[PDB]
Design an enzyme around this catalytic site. Structure first.
Site, PDB file in Angstrom:
ATOM      1  N   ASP A  62       7.032  -6.098 -36.892  1.00 26.52           N
ATOM      2  CA  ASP A  62       6.226  -4.905 -37.186  1.00 26.52           C
ATOM      3  C   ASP A  62       6.023  -4.638 -38.678  1.00 26.52           C
ATOM      4  O   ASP A  62       5.238  -3.769 -39.048  1.00 26.52           O
ATOM      5  CB  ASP A  62       6.691  -3.636 -36.419  1.00 26.52           C
ATOM      6  CG  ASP A  62       7.986  -3.040 -36.946  1.00 26.52           C
ATOM      7  OD1 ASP A  62       8.537  -3.510 -37.945  1.00 26.52           O
ATOM      8  OD2 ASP A  62       8.456  -2.056 -36.332  1.00 26.52           O
ATOM      9  N   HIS A  69      11.513  -8.050 -39.163  1.00 20.51           N
ATOM     10  CA  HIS A  69      10.810  -7.449 -38.035  1.00 20.51           C
ATOM     11  C   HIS A  69       9.331  -7.814 -38.060  1.00 20.51           C
ATOM     12  O   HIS A  69       8.658  -7.654 -39.087  1.00 20.51           O
ATOM     13  CB  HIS A  69      10.908  -5.928 -38.103  1.00 20.51           C
ATOM     14  CG  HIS A  69      12.305  -5.401 -37.995  1.00 20.51           C
ATOM     15  ND1 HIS A  69      12.612  -4.078 -38.217  1.00 20.51           N
ATOM     16  CD2 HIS A  69      13.475  -6.015 -37.689  1.00 20.51           C
ATOM     17  CE1 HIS A  69      13.912  -3.894 -38.050  1.00 20.51           C
ATOM     18  NE2 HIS A  69      14.457  -5.052 -37.731  1.00 20.51           N
ATOM     19  N   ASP A 124       0.738  -1.269   0.000  1.00 18.96           N
ATOM     20  CA  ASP A 124       0.000   0.000   0.000  1.00 18.96           C
ATOM     21  C   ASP A 124       0.780   1.340   0.000  1.00 18.96           C
ATOM     22  O   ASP A 124       0.165   2.406   0.115  1.00 18.96           O
ATOM     23  CB  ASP A 124      -1.082  -0.011   1.070  1.00 18.96           C
ATOM     24  CG  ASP A 124      -0.520   0.028   2.449  1.00 18.96           C
ATOM     25  OD1 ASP A 124       0.721   0.139   2.578  1.00 18.96           O
ATOM     26  OD2 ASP A 124      -1.320  -0.051   3.401  1.00 18.96           O
ATOM     27  N   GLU A 144       6.834  -6.820 -30.385  1.00 19.89           N
ATOM     28  CA  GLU A 144       5.519  -6.239 -30.149  1.00 19.89           C
ATOM     29  C   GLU A 144       4.974  -6.811 -28.867  1.00 19.89           C
ATOM     30  O   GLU A 144       5.559  -7.734 -28.295  1.00 19.89           O
ATOM     31  CB  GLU A 144       4.561  -6.516 -31.306  1.00 19.89           C
ATOM     32  CG  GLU A 144       4.874  -5.665 -32.526  1.00 19.89           C
ATOM     33  CD  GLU A 144       3.819  -5.760 -33.613  1.00 19.89           C
ATOM     34  OE1 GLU A 144       4.186  -5.599 -34.800  1.00 19.89           O
ATOM     35  OE2 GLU A 144       2.633  -5.967 -33.294  1.00 19.89           O
ATOM     36  N   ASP A 167      11.533  12.484 -17.207  1.00 18.64           N
ATOM     37  CA  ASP A 167      10.431  11.648 -16.740  1.00 18.64           C
ATOM     38  C   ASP A 167      10.711  10.160 -16.951  1.00 18.64           C
ATOM     39  O   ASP A 167      10.067   9.318 -16.333  1.00 18.64           O
ATOM     40  CB  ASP A 167       9.113  12.036 -17.419  1.00 18.64           C
ATOM     41  CG  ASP A 167       8.744  13.498 -17.195  1.00 18.64           C
ATOM     42  OD1 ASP A 167       9.026  14.332 -18.085  1.00 18.64           O
ATOM     43  OD2 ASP A 167       8.166  13.813 -16.130  1.00 18.64           O
ATOM     44  N   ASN A 170      16.962   1.342 -10.112  1.00 14.29           N
ATOM     45  CA  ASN A 170      17.279   2.740 -10.300  1.00 14.29           C
ATOM     46  C   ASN A 170      17.730   2.820 -11.751  1.00 14.29           C
ATOM     47  O   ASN A 170      18.787   2.312 -12.132  1.00 14.29           O
ATOM     48  CB  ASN A 170      18.408   3.104  -9.330  1.00 14.29           C
ATOM     49  CG  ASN A 170      18.948   4.506  -9.535  1.00 14.29           C
ATOM     50  OD1 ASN A 170      18.607   5.191 -10.498  1.00 14.29           O
ATOM     51  ND2 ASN A 170      19.816   4.934  -8.624  1.00 14.29           N
ATOM     52  N   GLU A 184       4.280  -0.797   7.153  1.00 12.83           N
ATOM     53  CA  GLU A 184       3.492  -1.299   8.280  1.00 12.83           C
ATOM     54  C   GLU A 184       4.405  -1.915   9.332  1.00 12.83           C
ATOM     55  O   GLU A 184       5.561  -2.239   9.041  1.00 12.83           O
ATOM     56  CB  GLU A 184       2.417  -2.296   7.811  1.00 12.83           C
ATOM     57  CG  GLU A 184       2.940  -3.617   7.267  1.00 12.83           C
ATOM     58  CD  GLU A 184       3.189  -3.600   5.772  1.00 12.83           C
ATOM     59  OE1 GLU A 184       3.247  -2.503   5.187  1.00 12.83           O
ATOM     60  OE2 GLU A 184       3.327  -4.695   5.175  1.00 12.83           O
TER      61      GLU A 184
END
Ligand code: CA
Ligand code: CA
Ligand code: CA
Ligand code: CA
Lengths: 639, 639
Positions: free
Chosen positions: B444, B442, B125, B383, B366, B152, B129
């Protein structure tokens, strides 16, 4: 399994149909340009459905029905029986334009149906069942399925393949495969050092079984014979599970289609079986003894006579071995560990062998042999508990116990190779104990297990220095302080060791308090990891001397390392202080054990040496019957 | 957990008691020789039971009760609260002989009770705890427990530790540990390259967090402070699960007792937490798009304008990247794969980066970055499917798809390092397809997935040569045979490619029938492994040319490799034959997709090059929101 097969117009497609699959068939691509509707005919043993936008309707062998041509309207083609020479299995599609009702073109599909199934005993009864739906998986437990393989622990003969697992390629079909097909059995490069497969390539010329899959052979083309046929293969495991190897291996069969020169063959159909290689399993002292093995020098006559008399009380056989140039004086205990492997309706004892100087022996053809540093690497440093349940978690084969040092200590540890091997067997879920406080560093110097006669229960026996000091202090209080140790060992006599001399040795008292802490640390781990309480434990008196590394060696023979044959215990003779002409250690040990129905026989392994310096020069080991519980019925924790 | 603590007579034993354990205490060894009975006193906060032969009775603080001295009569000692400076916690045992009722000797046990708990967020959570009973295990699924660690992916500052997991050592006790004890946090050598741990060693001097456990640091002594205290640690994962690493790591704390110089310290108490390192997870085309990344040459103006207009229809942001010396023209597709990691209340996107020539970029803080041969190693050859259920087995995160060759073919395969990495993440259960029939190789180039607007469902889109031939044959029948391909590409003009010229090329027809077999082999695997039926699939027209290796390259741009932003599809502009001034390929594709609510935008990536030889010089990739489903709620199959 649905497989794509497309028509081509003005022409014919020929395909092999493998039973258990079905074909979905595009009729729209073969439609000539401008064609509007189609109709179809098919033979008796081919089932055809027209599937439009998901809705399937069965079509008769010769109806006149027409459907609109659409990319979303396709055929589903199913066959329930293999083709024979009497078969003409086909589907014919006719195309129509708007103008009239006579076909403008037709596209055929000609089929040859065959059964192909690579079968193994997945349900674990010893018989190879037909196409077990679960054969491509391996699951643990009472309801678990998938086939089991034994490591081979020992042109070929069939008799020599008796220990291996059967794998059968079952086929049904016409006299030959259609042009451009072949059947190939294969394994991955990775599995090539884990398995081998044997087959008679030329049965017309004899029964010679040849090794067709394994190292450097990843595939084998197998001949197709018509009608109902079975090809028998024998499969061996090459190695046990280990750090990088889970124990699972796979074998595949594929029906391959020839496309053209220089282009790979297409795997039309593939069937797979999985095997798990059976783990090596250690036998605890509670299991019925079969054979007792001992090693000693030829002239240790008392040891031999007394071990013989012990074994004569039982139904066990005794096997006597002397000492070898390449092995320690304890080698039957230290360099050999008895265990077993089992597969459905097959199994044998398997010895692990780690010779001191390397191999240059073996007792009997009945055994498999797995042949491979500090003293912690010795098999004297391995034990296995009886079956236990710990906080609801059942260990039906018990748990292996391995002596070690504390994590931060920088002390000795059994080699990673062996630790990883034991962990990888998984079914005995090993626990590390603390043996590094002992000079030799073997768990068998401080602990053992014995069954409690007439019950299903057992006891943990622990060496205890506190018990020895208590006993000696009592005997001193009783007026026996001058009672002498080691009576009859002439090389000890000049030391005049008495209860008084022991009790007055202040440093020795301190050393043994410390060793009792070491024993107690183990007691706690054993209680935790085996789910034992104090009622499950008996303490046997023991005493140690400390070396320069602050490690312990026996002051008198460690009684805990004993021969356990059910109710009968061969216990090392301690040569303790005599009171009323009986050894007070022997009497004390009898008083602990005998009320439980255990029968004690003291075995003198040191008299032939005239003294005792902490080292025992004999060894024993016991081959036992395997557990009744089948290992594959366990559900080990996932890793 | 029961722990052994023995008395010593005429004297005192001092021990630390850790809450949550209890002590079993031998009183019989400290009994003087000849002593018959014992009695005991204890302090208010120590609970004492006399346990004889398994039967336990509570004993008062000062009673006069006497019991017979026996090895099977022991004490059980329990404390429910930690000691303070106001504590005198003790048990005193008095011994008696037969002669009288005055004690002949006494043995004390002096206790200091402390709480020690190494705590983590095991219940998942986001909060740590107190002492989760399951914290030493890691289990999968809705009810599963155990703590999660992030790799990391990017003296230390606390702000820099924000992405790491908290681990808290909670203690309670008096002002200091009794003489001869210390608390040590530690890890195994094996785990030392998997984790790191940070802690403020000197809080009086500042907040500096230092790296105390990891490579070359296996243990750290932590200072004890009295009263109720918490030590805060931050824990990082150093690497993802891989072939030899399951993802599980452990951290231990031990209370160690000093014995003497030159002797290891005894681990009195040990507490353990386990972490699983969160896997890297790939995002399928059905997940909400966040950012669109494209790469192209600066002057491909039509591509840029058209991609911008597409993205303007959505709430996505566009990120534009040009070409680099160390990277292919497709690098944003081929060398970068977007994925994410997640822990409770924490997660971020994580890019896998496999630069062609090696690193010399990145878009934004980000993201985490994982930086690492044939063309099958490209991320264009990876994929991931939408969530599927196959024969009752749910893959809530979908399944990764990797292009390969047939097992016996000797063809190309993605490097084992990458295959093993993807397999080890476990939660996307990868499937190998067949891409090796393509020059570039590939997946794709032949398949994609799109969501069906307004529903929770999706479609598989497959390249189809059969669809292209059907369409071209229809247009020829309709009188359009002279319709030209590649209008407006000046470098193609001299070839005068028309529908007639294509349809009359006999070798090209044969090549494309073979490529359709290759596509269909994949169709079958996809249907099997994704649990798809024909209603889940749409075929887009495609056409290929064959090279000297018998491998395929696009004749016209492969429309299947498209930008999927929910309902909006950026589809490569095919430059197909014009009929009534519209590309018949574009019209056909619209007719397939638009009825399903999909909006098609054709994106011209080749005009800037004036021709098309089978190679596309732009690439796109989409960062998407992660799945709502939490990966730790999956129950992957055991290995
Ligand atoms: Ca069977
Ligand atoms: Ca052993
Ligand atoms: Ca929590
Ligand atoms: Ca990709």
């Amino acid at each position: 399994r649905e497989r794509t097969v497309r028509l081509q117009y003005g022409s014919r497609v020929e395909a092999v149909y493998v039973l258990g699959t079905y074909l979905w068939t595009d009729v729209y691509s073969a439609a000539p340009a401008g064609a509007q509707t189609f109709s179809l005919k098919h033979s008796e043993h081919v089932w055809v459905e027209v599937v439009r936008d998901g809705e399937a309707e069965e079509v008769a062998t010769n109806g006149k029905q027409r459907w609109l041509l659409s990319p979303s309207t396709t055929l589903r083609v199913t066959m329930s029986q293999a083709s024979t020479e009497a078969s003409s299995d086909k589907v014919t599609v006719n195309y129509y334009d708007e103008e009239g009702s006579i076909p403008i073109d037709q596209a055929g599909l000609f089929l040859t149906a065959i059964e192909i199934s690579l079968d193994v005993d997945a349900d674990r009864d010893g018989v190879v069942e037909k196409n077990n739906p679960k054969k491509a998986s391996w699951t643990w437990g009472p309801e678990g399925q998938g086939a089991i393989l034994l490591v081979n622990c020992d042109v070929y003969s069939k008799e020599d393949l008796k220990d291996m697992s059967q794998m059968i390629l079952r086929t049904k079909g016409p006299d030959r495969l259609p042009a451009g097909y072949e059947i190939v059995l294969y394994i991955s490069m990775s599995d090539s050092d884990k398995v081998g497969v044997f087959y008679v390539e030329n049965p017309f010329f004899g029964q010679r079984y040849i090794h067709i899959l394994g190292r450097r052979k990843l595939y084998h083309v197998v001949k197709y014979t018509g009608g109902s046929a079975e090809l028998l293969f024998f499969v061996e495991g090459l190695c046990f599970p280990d750090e990088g190897f889970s124990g699972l291996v796979s074998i595949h069969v594929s029906l391959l289609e020839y496309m053209a020169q220089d282009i790979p063959l297409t795997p039309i159909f593939t069937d797979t079986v999985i095997f798990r290689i059976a783990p090596w399993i250690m036998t605890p002292n509670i299991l019925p003894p079969v054979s007792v093995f001992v090693c000693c020098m030829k002239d240790n006559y008392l040891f031999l006579k007394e071990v013989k008399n012990l074994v004569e009380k039982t139904n066990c056989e005794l096997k006597v071995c002397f000492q070898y140039l390449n092995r320690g004086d304890r080698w039957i205990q230290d360099e050999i560990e008895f265990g077993y492997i089992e597969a459905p309706h097959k199994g044998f004892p398997v010895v692990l062998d780690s010779p001191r100087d390397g191999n240059l022996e073996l007792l009997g053809p009945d055994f498999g042999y797995v042949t491979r540093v500090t003293s912690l690497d010795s098999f004297g440093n391995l034990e296995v508990s009886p079956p236990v349940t710990v906080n609801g978690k059942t260990y039906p084969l018990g748990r292996i116990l391995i002596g070690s040092s504390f994590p931060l200590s920088g002390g000795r540890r059994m080699t990673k190779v062996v630790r990883d091997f034991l962990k990888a067997q998984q079914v005995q879920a090993p626990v590390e104990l603390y043996s590094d406080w002992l000079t030799v560093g073997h768990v068998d110097e401080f602990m053992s297990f014995v069954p409690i006669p007439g019950t299903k229960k057992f006891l943990l026996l622990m060496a205890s220095t506190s018990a020895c000091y208590k006993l000696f202090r009592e005997k001193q209080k009783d007026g026996h302080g001058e009672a002498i140790m080691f009576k009859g060992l002439g090389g000890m006599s000049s030391k005049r060791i008495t209860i008084n001399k022991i009790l007055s040795n202040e440093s020795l008292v301190q050393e043994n308090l410390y060793f009792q802490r070491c024993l107690d640390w183990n007691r706690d781990i054993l209680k935790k990891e085996l789910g034992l309480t104090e009622q499950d434990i008996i303490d046997l008196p023991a005493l140690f001397k400390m070396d320069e590394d602050h490690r312990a060696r026996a002051f008198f023979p460690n009684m805990v390392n004993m021969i356990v044959l059910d109710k009968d215990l061969g216990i090392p003779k301690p040569f303790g202080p005599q009171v009323e002409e009986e050894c007070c250690l022997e009497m004390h040990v009898r008083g602990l054990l005998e009320p439980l129905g255990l029968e004690c026989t003291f075995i003198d392994d040191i008299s032939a040496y005239h003294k005792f310096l902490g080292e025992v020069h004999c060894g024993t080991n016991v081959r036992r019957k395997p557990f009744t519980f089948k290992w594959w019925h366990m559900v080990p924790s996932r890793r």
